[PDB]
Design a protein around this ligand. Sequence first.
Ligand code: V9Y
Ligand code: V9Y
Ligand code: NA
Ligand code: NA
Ligand code: NI
Ligand code: NI
Ligand code: NI
Ligand code: NI
Ligand code: NI
Ligand code: NI
Ligand code: NI
Ligand code: NI
Lengths: 173, 173, 173, 173, 173, 173
Amino acid sequence: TSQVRQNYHQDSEAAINRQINLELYASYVYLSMSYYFDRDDVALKNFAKYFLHQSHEEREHAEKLMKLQNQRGGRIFLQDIQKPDEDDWESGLNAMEAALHLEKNVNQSLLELHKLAHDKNDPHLADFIETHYLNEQVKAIKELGDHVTNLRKMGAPESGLAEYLFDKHTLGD
Amino acid sequence: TSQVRQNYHQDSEAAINRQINLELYASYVYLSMSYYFDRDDVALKNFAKYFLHQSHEEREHAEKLMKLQNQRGGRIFLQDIQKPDEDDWESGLNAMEAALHLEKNVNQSLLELHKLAHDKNDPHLADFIETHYLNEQVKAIKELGDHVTNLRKMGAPESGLAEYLFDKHTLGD
Amino acid sequence: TSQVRQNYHQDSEAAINRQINLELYASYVYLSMSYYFDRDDVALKNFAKYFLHQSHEEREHAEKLMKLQNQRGGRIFLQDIQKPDEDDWESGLNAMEAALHLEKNVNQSLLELHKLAHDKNDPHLADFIETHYLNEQVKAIKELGDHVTNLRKMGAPESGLAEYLFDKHTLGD
Amino acid sequence: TSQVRQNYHQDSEAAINRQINLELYASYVYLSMSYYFDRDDVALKNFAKYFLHQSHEEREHAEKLMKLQNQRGGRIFLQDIQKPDEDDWESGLNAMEAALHLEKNVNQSLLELHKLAHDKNDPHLADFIETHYLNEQVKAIKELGDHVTNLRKMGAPESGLAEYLFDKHTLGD
Amino acid sequence: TSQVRQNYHQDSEAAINRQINLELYASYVYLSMSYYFDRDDVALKNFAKYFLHQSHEEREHAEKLMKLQNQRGGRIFLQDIQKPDEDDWESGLNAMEAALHLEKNVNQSLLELHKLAHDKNDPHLADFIETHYLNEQVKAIKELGDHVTNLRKMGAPESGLAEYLFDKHTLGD
Amino acid sequence: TSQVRQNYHQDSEAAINRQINLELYASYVYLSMSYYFDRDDVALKNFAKYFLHQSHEEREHAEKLMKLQNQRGGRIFLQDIQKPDEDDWESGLNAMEAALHLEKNVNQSLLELHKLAHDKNDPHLADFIETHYLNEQVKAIKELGDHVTNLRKMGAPESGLAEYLFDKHTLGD
Ligand SMILES: O=C(NO)c1ccc(C(=O)NO)o1
Ligand SMILES: O=C(NO)c1ccc(C(=O)NO)o1
Ligand code: NA
Ligand code: NA
Ligand code: NI
Ligand code: NI
Ligand code: NI
Ligand code: NI
Ligand code: NI
Ligand code: NI
Ligand code: NI
Ligand code: NI
């Protein structure tokens, strides 16, 4: 067993490995959505930028977790990364709703991880989640919610005008 | 015969002269479209800027080819430049669709030129096309396609609002 | 009829369209001459620069006229652009003499246009010609005349030395 | 079918989708190796930096291909990303040899893709591979080969001294 | 066999070694011509500069090829470098004509190398030639052709005045 | 006979031509060694840099001599440049020992040239050797000797560790 390990339960170690896989999956989902808005029959440059940025942020989530794992003494075990549910996201509104759903999923997974960490009385891991992950998910969900509300009040996804204007006036700057 | 000529088939020379004429024709077409959007009963300043820029780019395409011709030892033979098909382009959407069609035309002509160059085992001419022309046409077509898709999703050419907003939010910056 | 049109006779409109075509033709002629001096069996870099610059200046002449047309309420009607008289200009001296002739041609066409403008009592169009075109042609003709005189006093086109030195000492800087 | 598609064979489209998946797989492999050198019982910071950089470069390979796909008119179809062959890479030397093998694999896949592109007479796609991928793989293989040779001449993986010094004197700067 | 070798035919390897030798030979020829214009009974400083620069450029051609060879897995085999055909180049015009001939020779050798590379379906080597060698030879030949034409139209090599003026007005700046 | 010649014995002229050939040969030898350390199965970047620099320095030795020759009134006569003795230099230590031997050879040739120059009472040529060549060879030999001693005291060429560390700690900076 690793010389640095201390107060690191194997249940925690397994949760960390699962969370790593999930963050990588989310990165894959966001990559999918981004290049779906790059298509010549969708053509929403700023939606594409937005989801590409979110993809890279989830990738950094994963890497932060892997470094945490090696720091505590656990061992990283990588699994396959599943293909996203869809290859075609229909609209900007629907991609936003999907992203909101995905982030609520990852949030619940993190909440159960923090619960397991408090239960195995691992306060350092509990605070690592408290600091680097919980509030980022709260912000991400509130932001996606704002986006969904605005796109809806504009008549998306019926009005193609709505998505075109949103792309310019919100996801530009 | 010119002292510099080497491995330059006369079939290639004829193709180059034809491509020169075609690039000049395209420049004329884009000039037409540009000043059609300058009209007081159309009045789309940014459409006008866009097609004027594209006109000058095609002019430089032609000049690059003429310099290539003199470099290989061929001789430039200029022909008349035909008037564009139309004097009135109806709308911004229709001008975009016409431009997309014209660029697919010039692309197919360039592809047949590259084929002829590979067949007469003229690798320098093949790579000149590979480098300075093929990818520029791929980019131009994808861009015009984006423009057509967006203008359509906004309700062009019915909605005059759509073309007015596109002119400002996409062809401005 | 266009909402901006005022005091713009249709005879003037036709003259403007013809002058546009002629300026474009001249641009084509200068393009021809330029790349004739780019040939490996002529090889006069500064002659080439000179006629390329003159080509682009005539192109701007045309565009200025097209904008004038749309400003007055007329409608631009583009015609074919004829191939230059020659594909081979023999020498620097002969190209200069041809250019002088072409500019005297375009000058006479502009003078008849100004006459028509004064006759249809269109003072704005008369002054547009007075300002942006007449004096430029006077300068261009005097300059080409200087060039022809110098090239002749040097023994062009017999002396190839003469054209080589002129290219360096006059068309360089 | 997409409005921009021209001369893009569906066999090419399938090859592109497969190459995208493979570049993503390679990125996953390099991520694995990197965080294997982050372990407290391996502890080779510069090996870790090296393979993390290579991971991000392969990720950009994938994204470049996805943008190419949307540009030509094809449609991106994402598949699962397989877990790397190993979870434990034994040594710096063995990780280098594995990386060399993986890059020879991806190189052969790209070579067969270029062959298919030349056969379906798709010169733009052939040159896209020629430019953005072939030489990068030649460089990567020669570099990994240098690394393997040096690590071997130093007595890796027996001598832990060898890997420690290589980490500092080659992968530092 | 070298660990990096992949898709590198031994016929290609032999062609590369021969091309290395030929580029070195050309460098030797240009060195010869340069210091022939340094002689007190020729005394053409700018001709000398010109051919010395061209000598060093051919030397870099050779070195680029040697690095390519080691990159693909081949092995560099150096041969003797033959003395130039002449020790006395008669005139500036004759040196230029000789240089034009030599560059057409090396161009044909490179063209046959590119043919062999396309035939052994080595696209990376084909593109290495396409990029770093073919167009440089096209430019070099067109430039030498310009020089020969100008020197001839000035009455070289009879007129010593012609070569003296060319040295100053073309090979200076 | 050349108008500038004064006190320049033909025996000296022949010695100069031979020394030119020898400096060029040495440049070829150093080029060989350099790209031998570029091989993926040798891979000593700094050895490669070192011998490439030495190659270019010998090339400048040759050119300095050729300019000296034209200055005194002699005539440069170029001969073939022989291939180096070896195509494979075994190790860094052995390349260093070979280079030391080659520089002692060229030094003895220069010493006999200075002797011939003092004997034909050519003090300018004697001092040209004294200044631009003798001390450079003394420095080069002492430096190569230092290198050989250090590589030996480190256990080269047995210890591959020794050559790897020398490459970094001495030939880097
Ligand atoms: O917050 C707690 N530990 O940190 C906790 C959870 C349940 C209990 C308990 O058993 N109360 O009776 O305590
Ligand atoms: O056999 C052939 N046609 O029937 C053939 C000759 C050369 C090529 C070719 O261009 N390969 O890349 O193909
Ligand atoms: Na290419
Ligand atoms: Na006035
Ligand atoms: Ni996340
Ligand atoms: Ni509690
Ligand atoms: Ni074009
Ligand atoms: Ni004009
Ligand atoms: Ni890759
Ligand atoms: Ni060369
Ligand atoms: Ni082929
Ligand atoms: Ni020397």
